Amino acid sequence: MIQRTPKIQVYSRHPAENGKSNFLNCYVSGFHPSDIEVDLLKNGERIEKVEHSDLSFSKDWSFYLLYCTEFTPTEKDEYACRVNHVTLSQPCIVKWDRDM
Amino acid sequence: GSHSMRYFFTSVSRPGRGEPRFIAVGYVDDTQFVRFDSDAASQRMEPRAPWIEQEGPEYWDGETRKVKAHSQTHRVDLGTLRGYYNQSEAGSHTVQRMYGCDVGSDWRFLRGYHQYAYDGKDYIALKEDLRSWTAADMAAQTTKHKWEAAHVAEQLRAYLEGTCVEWLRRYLENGKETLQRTDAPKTHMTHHAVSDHEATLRCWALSFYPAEITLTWQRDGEDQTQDTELVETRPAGDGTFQKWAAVVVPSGQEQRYTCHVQHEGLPKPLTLRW
Amino acid sequence: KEVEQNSGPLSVPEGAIASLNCTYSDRGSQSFFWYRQYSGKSPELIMSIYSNGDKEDGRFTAQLNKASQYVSLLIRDSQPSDSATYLCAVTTDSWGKLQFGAGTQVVVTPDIQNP
Amino acid sequence: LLFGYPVYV
Amino acid sequence: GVTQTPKFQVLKTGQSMTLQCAQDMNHEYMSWYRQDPGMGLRLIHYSVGAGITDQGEVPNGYNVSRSTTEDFPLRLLSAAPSQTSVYFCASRPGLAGGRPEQYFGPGTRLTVTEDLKNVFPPEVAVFLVCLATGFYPDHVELSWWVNGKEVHSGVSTDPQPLYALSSRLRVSATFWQNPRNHFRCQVQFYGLAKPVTQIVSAEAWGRAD
Ligand code: EMC
Ligand code: EMC
């Protein structure tokens, strides 16, 4: 059967300005099988109020999913995403970089 | 000004864990409007767009019923397929199905679709003539004969060429403001100096809808996109999309490089100079 | 969902046109049919239309106007054997409930040349 | 609107 | 196609009865209807698959099962005079086929009475017309049989019993005026005192005049 590794992207909805309200996004795409575990992190701790989308897929049958959490960025706060899928020997963590 | 309606369905077996998972999602362009999820509470087809809400009891009752029929057929298929391939009851398996229709600028029927996959690859697909089936292997041939005898393509053709386009047009009008809208991308560039001899230019398309877009890096004719990094167009979360492309340009030649933005909300293809 | 049918008894002479009308309420209906029921017998299917347009196969002609939610049946070259009551049925899906009209009665009177 | 005639494989 | 038995049935209030129905088309969706002059067809019960059963428009007084996909029996446990009507069984393919058409079964005629004293077979008389009279219930199968072989050519009986029932057989004088041909008006009665299901006939020979 087919096995595809997820491509992860952690970005915000709007250009990040410290002190202003924004939305942090972790877009996971191109995976297979469907079972995947995604968490948004702040200073290395689990963020609870995170919303995820209805599982869908692309022309090549690979799945895509979006996770997000409203947030106010600062100069010292660190945010990342943590994804777990059978193609990953160990959970893959992708840090948020405000340029991207 | 083409449009399209699509439905995506996903089935996953839960070995040693009860009934399989079933998800069904409907979309009109890049905008989802309904959903069904076996894990959810209501256990009915639900709205995901504001314009679909004023549809009525008869709509939701019928859509719910029809979505349960698809779940039942899929639930049974998971067992059938494991039979055809003689797989063990120990492993998890996936089935996905998709169908929809595309209408041209005049909103008249253009193309019709119905694909089916098992374990991540094509199993059986209806042909563009909407009268023939393409089987992926010997096992899928069983299904093909079974469906030819059952007169299924006859049924799909009727739906994909009519009802599908009729209802799409209905949604297009009802979602006039949301769907027939077109947003031009807020483009700009950025430069990240790695060192005195290594520079990175990043083209940025943001806040555009629909997601259809093509970004190209070209140096006055140079096919640089062949060596450009492009990320999958991503969702912003408010109905719009974002995407970017970047190349490693050795300091100096960067000002000769120009980016090309292609989107339906732009009259002439933008060319940004650095 | 409900189906409204033509009227009471429709009498037409042998050789004439018998035209029946049908109207439904559920906009999402996908399948449409016409049944013929001979007195003291069971409803027999005579027509099925899955696309809106004119299906003219046999001596029967069926029209479907989804936009107006209207169905038709025109019996050309009427024979007295056609005398039966015609039932209109409509459905949404394979698990949907079939819904018929009250039925419209057709009586094809024969040509007597002299009494 | 959903299709109304799915069939087992 | 769809077969169903019995054809006719008389019962008195309290008697239970099961209307059998079968289909060999490998259909998963079967249903039961009753047809009354003022309402037309009305769904009683229906089943989309084996073991799945649901009530329709007028399920009161009826019972129903579906262990197999081939049969779908309708069971009345204690008959009632209101249950007098024509029962049609029908089937659609369900998830087993793309053909939307629903097929009906032949039908079963049932009648129920509270303090039984009725069920009188008819009294046939030939006059060319025939005449079956005083029968109850309206369960009769009438035919014309010349020289031991039924005819359909000039036969024109009434659509439904007026019980009493009329019928015509109009042939020209040449075949009737032949002394050696015999006509018989046969009437099959469906019944149970002794009014068992019977075959009451009448006759006349081709006169010479
Ligand atoms: C799942 C969209 Hg925040
Ligand atoms: C390639 C480890 Hg995330």
Question: Strands across the sheet with A45-46, in order?
Answer: A45-46, A37-42, A79-84, A92-95
Q: Which domain holds residue C3?
A: 1-115
For residue C24, the SS3 value is strand
Pairwise CA distance, residues B132 & B17, whole Å = 38
Token readout for B208 is: 């555009």
Q: What is the 3-state secondary structure (H, E, C) of chain B?
A: CCEEEEEEEEEECCCCCCCCEEEEEEECCCCEEEEEECCCCCCCCEECCHHHHHHCHHHHHHHHHHHHHHHHHHHHHHHHHHHHCCCCCCCCCEEEEEEEEEECCCCCEEEEEEEEEECCEEEEEECCCCCCEEECCHHHHHHHHHHHHCCHHHHHHHHHHHHHHHHHHHHHHHCHHHHCCCECCCCEEEEEEEECCEEEEEEEEEEEECCCCEEEEEECCEEHHHHCEECCCEECCCCCEEEEEEEEECCCHHHHCEEEEECCCCCCCEEEEC
Q: Cβ contact (<8 Å) for C95 and B158?
A: no
Ligand nearest to the CA of A85: 2
- Is the bond preceding residue E6 a cis peptide, omega within 30 degrees? yes
Q: Phi/psi of residue A85, each to 5°? A: -150, 150
CATH topology for E1-114 is Immunoglobulin-like (2.60.40)
Nearest CA in chain C to E94: C94
Ligand nearest to the CA of A51: 1
- Is the bond preceding residue E81 a cis peptide, omega within 30 degrees? no
Q: What is the 3-state secondary structure (H, E, C) of B174-234?
A: HCHHHHCCCECCCCEEEEEEEECCEEEEEEEEEEEECCCCEEEEEECCEEHHHHCEECCCE
How many angstroms separate the CA of residue D5 from the nearest CA in chain B? 7
Q: What letter would DSSP give residue E134?
A: S
Burial state string for A56-82 with b = 16 or more CB within 10 A and e = fewer than 16: bbeeebbbbbbbbbebebeeeeebbbb
Side-chain half-sphere exposure of E57, counting CA atoms within 13 A? 13
CATH 2.60.40.10 positions along chain E are: 1-114, 115-206
Region of B269 (left: φ > 0; alpha: ψ -120 to 50; beta: rest) is: beta
Kindly give the residue spans of alpha helices, DSSP state H, lying in chain E. 173-176
- Is the bond preceding residue A33 a cis peptide, omega within 30 degrees? yes
Query: Could you tell me if E203 and E183 are in contact, meaning their C-beta atoms sit under 8 angstroms apart?
Result: yes
Which experimental technique did the depositors report for determining this structure?
X-ray
Pairwise CA distance, residues B191 & B257, whole Å = 12
Q: Where are the domains of chain B?
A: 1-181, 182-270
Pairwise CA distance, residues E185 & B273, whole Å = 104
Contacts of D8 in chain E (CB under 8 A): 95-96
Pairwise CA distance, residues B18 & B135, whole Å = 30
- Other CB atoms within a 10 A radius of the CB of residue E177 amount to 12
Side-chain half-sphere exposure of B95, counting CA atoms within 13 A? 24
CATH number of domain containing C71: 2.60.40.10
Q: What letter would DSSP give residue E128?
A: -
Which one of C27, C51, C95 has the shortest CB-CB distance to B65? C95
Contacts of B78 in chain D (CB under 8 A): none
Burial class of E79 by CB neighbour count within 10 A (0 to 12, 13 to 18, 19+): buried
Burial class of C20 by CB neighbour count within 10 A (0 to 12, 13 to 18, 19+): buried
Ligand 1 is surrounded, with C-beta below 6 A, by: A 51-53, 66, 68; B 237
Pairwise CA distance, residues C91 & B155, whole Å = 14
Q: Cβ contact (<8 Å) for B116 and D7?
A: no
- Is the bond preceding residue E195 a cis peptide, omega within 30 degrees? no
Of B82, B103, B80, B106, whose CA–CA distance to B92 is shortest? B82
Q: Which of residues 1-9 of D touch B (CB under 8 A)?
A: 1-9
Token readout for C91 is: 């459905």
Pairwise CA distance, residues A86 & E33, whole Å = 54
- Measured CA angle at C40 (ends C38, C46), to 5 deg: 30
List residues bridging with E203 in a β-sheet: E184
CA of A23 to the centre of ligand 2 (A): 25
List residues bridging with C41 in a β-sheet: none
Q: What letter would DSSP give residue E69?
A: S
Architecture of domain B182-270: Sandwich (2.60)
Pairing of strands A79-84, B198-208: unpaired
Atom of ligand 1 nearest to the CA of A52: 1
Residues sharing a CB contact under 8 Å with residue B100, sequence separation 6 or more, in sequence order: B4, B5, B6, B7, B112, B113, B160, B164
DSSP string, E95-107: GG-S----EE---
CATH topology for B1-181 is 3.30.500
- Other CB atoms within a 10 A radius of the CB of residue C84 amount to 20
Residues sharing a CB contact under 8 Å with residue B54, sequence separation 6 or more, in sequence order: B174
Architecture of domain A1-100: Sandwich (2.60)
Residues sharing a CB contact under 8 Å with residue C7, sequence separation 6 or more, in sequence order: C104
Token readout for E43 is: 């769904």
Mutation target among B115, B138, B155 for the D interface, most CBs of D within 10 A: B155
Pairwise CA distance, residues C11 & B83, whole Å = 59
List residues bridging with E25 in a β-sheet: none
Architecture of domain E115-206: Sandwich (2.60)
Query: Could you tell me if C23 and C69 are in contact, meaning their C-beta atoms sit under 8 angstroms apart?
Result: yes
Is C31's Cβ below 8 Å from some Cβ in B? no
Is C2's Cβ below 8 Å from some Cβ in B? no
CA of B29 to the centre of ligand 1 (A): 18
- Other CB atoms within a 10 A radius of the CB of residue E174 amount to 8
- Other CB atoms within a 10 A radius of the CB of residue B213 amount to 19
- Other CB atoms within a 10 A radius of the CB of residue E141 amount to 13
Pairwise CA distance, residues A74 & A72, whole Å = 7
How far, CA to CA in Å, does B219 sit from each of B249, B258, C14? 11, 6, 83
Resolution of the structure, angstroms? 2.6
List residues bridging with B236 in a β-sheet: none
Contacts of E28 in chain D (CB under 8 A): none
- Other CB atoms within a 10 A radius of the CB of residue B206 amount to 17
Query: Could you tell me if E4 and E29 are in contact, meaning their C-beta atoms sit under 8 angstroms apart?
Result: no
Amino acid at E111: T
How many angstroms separate the CA of residue B181 from the nearest CA in chain E? 38
Burial class of B127 by CB neighbour count within 10 A (0 to 12, 13 to 18, 19+): exposed
- Measured CA angle at B269 (ends B201, B191), to 5 deg: 10
Q: Cβ contact (<8 Å) for E95 and B76?
A: yes
